């Protein structure tokens, strides 16, 4: 795992992605901090969001554990910051990288998945009243992410 993580890290330095940053905190290559900018044209625009990333000792044959540390209003992300995303469990591919995982995450922010959401009350709102959902999502962004 260590070589593969170093390679990803080297690639990140060689081609930094826009809106996303990730890398080790300390000397521990297996625990990373990451940030994501709120995508433009969504309720999270202008917000900054922090995540923690823990790589398993058999990475990349198992997915990294990824979680938000910033409060965010979204059907797939609960108050422990856990994310409901298939590529992080069953649909993980060993060819995925943190760069791509973070991007998948941004993608989820703009377009929530209606199937089997983590925070049903939010999904319920998103399903019925969108003005409500968007409003609260922005307020949450204004409050916690800026």
């Amino acid at each position: 795992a260590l070589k593969r993580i170093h390679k990803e890290l080297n690639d990140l330095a060689r081609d930094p992605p826009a809106q996303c940053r990730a890398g080790p905190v300390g000397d521990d290559m297996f625990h990373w901090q990451a940030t994501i900018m709120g995508p433009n044209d969504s309720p999270y625009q202008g917000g900054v969001f922090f995540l923690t990333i823990h790589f398993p000792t058999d990475y990349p044959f198992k997915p990294p554990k990824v979680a938000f540390t910033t409060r965010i209003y979204h059907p797939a992300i609960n108050s422990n910051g856990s994310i409901s995303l298939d590529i992080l469990r069953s649909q993980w591919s060993p060819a995925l990288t943190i760069s791509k995982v973070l991007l998948s995450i941004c993608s989820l922010l703009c377009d929530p998945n209606p199937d089997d959401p983590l925070v049903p009350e939010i999904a319920r709102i998103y399903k019925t009243d969108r003005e409500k959902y968007n409003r609260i999502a922005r307020e949450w962004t204004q409050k916690y992410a800026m």
Partner: protein, 57 residues
Amino acid sequence: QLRRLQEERTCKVCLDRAVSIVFVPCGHLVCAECAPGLQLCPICRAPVRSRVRTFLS
């Protein structure tokens, strides 16, 4: 332009060794060290119905 070549032959799972093993039917490759655990192609998700060791000389 040599980076185009050395990175075209690099296994995209481990990001380290050169590819050797071809997945059929999809046709994607991985290195021999990464291949055995893989039932689905890491690149396209195609089921791997068989894998073939290649010799590129």
